Point group: D2
Chain length 332, copies 4
């Protein structure tokens, strides 16, 4: 058995050499993960289900856990005295940590991914993206430190709260998965080099929004449903409704997750900086691919803190098929 | 706070008056649920993921947890000295408990529902159906005690192993949900009278098998995707891949679960006695509806222990729509 | 592995044949045990340490946990609808359960034994004594049902909250020990027939009260300290300060627990009905002995609900030595 | 709420300024503490009770947990890549960690204190002492780095596995206590500046070894038993049999722990380096006193790795009384 902490110590060569800082960063993450896990694991008996009475900066009806997760992760990150500030999907502005002007890291987060699944005992998660600041240390970080392109991330990962609670991350040298052991109260390594299998046979998308999908996506969907054993078609459909959850399964069994533009979300629903970039960094480290249907997610220059974007991620051949259909059937 | 055990004591009028027997029956269930929960909650750290090397009587590639769950629930039921025998989706024949010829109850079970989700940290469950034997007490039960129609069940329910572990059941007087509290090691009441909301806006089906669905189901699907605010359309799509899990969400938020006949499963994939009947008894007690697309699931006279059947379950208006389309578009 | 519940089902011949009632009784016990264990296991982080601001009917400064334990066990017993009423070391009068006039059992309890050890993370426990009522069923129990001699107990046992939480009990056919498994949330059998070893080498007493002990006890103490290998002397001294805890160790390794009359407690400190009788029933079922220094604890006719009594319990030869010294050195 | 990790970050001024190193050191400690806690918390259900079949370098019959604890803590310390080597009460020689010649810290430990209490569900503990090496970094530590006087410790503390699991330590700026929360899987601060109360009224000693105690100790004992309200006498007696446990209680309620020379242990039973020094450093930081009956424990120049020593520790006035009686009654 090897804990997450010991693994971080072990892999000194990773993280651009800062072992002690990576430890503090992930220590804050798992602390927050543990705190959140506790409430979720007893959701029905704990008063955490339902709307908090506030509306997201995303223009969404916030749930109580969303806020709880937000505050806990935020306090956990501020207490390690290692981050200068954070950006969160539940916050309107960036949060500058007072007294941390000295810190050289910033963290972008999606505190509780899969809000719709909280009340129904279905998998939810947490997503984090870590960047090295660009502004002068000793000064308060600015949006400039939060609008860097995905290819500049020094770390990214997620926590999935499912039948078991796992923490998955990368620093640019493969994707490592750790499982929380309630018997010990520690995260243990369960898979050091996660990689998408050779071929994927599952597509994850909200087919209820069919009519409003780009014509290329509609065609790809039809493609998935055609019969062709030579290529494992028709594919199996799986859509949990939680990004972290569907991503995790697809990484283990192979598959693709799709969230294109719809009527309600002209530019896709997911957010570039809190959801797309971190998951793209992960998908790529696993030998997969992630694009907005045309260009590489990690190379997109962010325009606004809460910018949204179409997202297609998973096995390379599958994502490549999507890109080809959009190419052959551009939506007029 | 009120535990499952205290609730059973409290609701004396339910279960056709046998409080002490209902307690023993569910005591075996939660014991098995707890044992299974333990392994699943640490799946990655425990050697339980993967094929066991055997093939189901369903002609399926059995997973290790499937067997584990089977043996544990079976031993738990035999140890309460309250059941004469069991039938299981993982067993070829009925299991007659030696020394229990005196018992007057039989239990049909789906030890581990959602086998495909075990290795990917996604929700799985357990389904149980309880019948009062028809054969003379003191004698070994026969298939006759296991082939009774669904309307004869004296109890049914399920265990869902998701972000939290819950036990949901009914004895004919509403559906009660209990959440397991790891802090206490007990199941606590969290919802006494679960009922489907007035309207449902979600459909759960494996759309990858589209081309092979009955034409009426294909039409219903298209219907779900049309735009019509007056009727909350298009609906949201959600398909976890675990029957228990999708059912649970639909019962709480409203929706319909569909598993019609396909090329691989001419008579639907789900099994009448271990999956359809218990979930139909539950759906009905919640004010919902469950049919095979034409007739009431609970009134079907079972022909074989492992008989399969098309299954449409959830909000009544939604299930009624499915039945209407199959009616208007009979598949030639 | 075999749980407490399954063991009770198994040993049908015990408990004067009432399996279903013994199950309900102990089910209430472990529920209360679990609830108490939860707070104690996190005592430092939970606001439960310190005086509650009330004085025991024992004329003692009550601690918060004492009351918590009292209320929880009381509510747990009332909710099983199996007990007509209870008597407790923390209550002035007997508690008659409204609506349970039909119940035929009464329970006497010491909700939290070892009050002085609660704040210092040291072992504490719970003691229960179960009697069959003597008053007409259908009527409210009276003190008469609570003042029966110890030899009339149909059951007795204790819960020890130490490095691990165990439940030890007897119904007149040996002493059975069960350990709580936090991983499963169930009590598992760990020792079916506990018996004192052949010889004991440990004495448990509060030697700080030496000068005020009966002269016979002072002599026994000196005896324990003499050197004599032929008889394993001098003995080892062990006094945890918690009756349940010192008893448990002595039952496993052999030894004697002593609490004679002192200046502050002319008739010993322990209470006959809530502490002495149950532990005496247990000690005897393990092949041990329990007396007030002269006569058999279990045969004493109780005079008052809160009567106190000298208590010497453990290996028979050791208790016999105490009785001999008191005999040879009667305190004038 | 504040975790142990966050507290360490917070108190930068302590530990002679090495926050990142103190974190790694205690991280290894709690990991080991957690691992040990897991087995102990289920001792009866886990095969860990009983002799391992080997004899300590102490000439004692080793128990299975003793060895388990030893190996786990040892592996946990080696995996942090922060310690050059360790000395343990269960090891004959010092353990030099290969590949850690670069580390500048050494740890002396008593992996499992209170071996006699393991099988009887009574409190046990773990003791650690941390020193900064004296030998040239880059070279393998030698006994010289392990035979430094107690006053050179840069850190010390213990883990007590009782009704709850706590971690208590000091780096020279007061004694801090943390409680493990099984609900979260983290150690939380529960008391930042533990101090002995003004006066103590409890003495902890194995009075079974009376006849062989130094005459001064025999007199002190008699003193404790005299009646004198003006000075809270006679004192209460408490002796759990576990050093860590009796120490903890005495620190919270006030008292003294005594283990003088006996027939079997001419130089006391406790070991200077693994038991006396760390507990003396702790007692002193709490405003208490610790001596061998004549001189200050922390100033004694260690002669051998496994040197034993008389130990009197707790409230200053009580320890001072012991020293006075030994002075007035030197044992001829
Ligand atoms: O309800 P739809 O439109 O399918 O959106 C589902 C997607 O939205 C997200 C957004 O984070 O969930 P949610 O809005 O419920 O938080 C993703 O986790 C998920 O993949
Ligand atoms: O893979 P598909 O064909 O969608 O089948 C999913 C359905 O099959 C079942 C059968 O029990 O899961 P599984 O076969 O993986 O055990 C249901 O739980 C689930 O709803
Ligand atoms: O403090 P002293 O007088 O030794 O009393 C200890 C005895 O008293 C009892 C009484 O129950 O503890 P406590 O009063 O602290 O509750 C026994 O558990 C214990 O054996
Ligand atoms: O059995 P006695 O001689 O009282 O020794 C008890 C003392 O010895 C120690 C030594 O560590 O316990 P143990 O030998 O059982 O490990 C101390 O923890 C305890 O205070
Ligand atoms: Mg999200
Ligand atoms: Mg199934
Ligand atoms: Mg008591
Ligand atoms: Mg020790």
């Amino acid at each position: 058995m090897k804990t997450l902490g010991e693994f971080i110590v072990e892999k000194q060569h990773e993280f651009s050499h800062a072992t002690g800082e990576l430890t503090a960063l992930l220590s804050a993450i798992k602390l927050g993960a543990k705190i959140i896990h506790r409430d979720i694991n007893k959701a029905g008996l704990v008063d955490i289900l339902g709307a908090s009475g506030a509306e997201n900066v995303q223009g969404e009806v916030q749930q109580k856990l969303d806020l709880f997760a937000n505050e806990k992760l935020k306090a956990a990150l501020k207490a390690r005295d290692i981050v200068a500030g954070i950006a969160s999907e539940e916050e309107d502005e960036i949060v500058v940590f007072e007294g941390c002007e000295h810190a050289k890291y910033v963290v972008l987060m999606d505190p509780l991914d899969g809000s719709s699944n909280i009340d129904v005992n279905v998998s939810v998660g947490t997503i984090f993206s870590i960047y090295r600041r660009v502004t002068p240390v000793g000064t308060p970080v600015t949006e400039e430190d939060f609008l860097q392109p995905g290819n500049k991330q020094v770390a990214a990962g997620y926590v999935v709260y499912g039948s078991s609670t796992m923490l998955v991350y990368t620093t640019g040298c493969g994707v490592h998965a750790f499982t929380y052991d309630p018997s010990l109260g520690v995260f243990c390594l369960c898979q050091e080099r996660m990689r998408f299998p050779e071929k994927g046979k599952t597509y994850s998308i909200n087919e209820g929004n069919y009519i409003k999908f780009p014509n290329g996506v509609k065609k790809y969907i039809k493609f998935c449903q055609e019969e062709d054993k030579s290529t494992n078609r028709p594919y199996t459909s799986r859509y949990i409704g939680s990004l972290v959850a569907d991503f995790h399964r697809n990484l283990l069994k192979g598959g693709i997750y799709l969230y294109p533009s719809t009527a309600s979300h002209p530019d896709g629903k997911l957010r570039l900086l809190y959801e797309c970039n971190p998951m793209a960094f992960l998908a790529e480290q696993a030998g997969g691919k992630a694009s907005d249907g045309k260009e590489r997610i990690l190379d997109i220059i962010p325009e606004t803190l809460h910018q949204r974007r179409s997202f297609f991620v998973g096995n390379d051949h599958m994502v490549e098929d999507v890109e080809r259909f959009i190419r052959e059937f551009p939506d007029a």
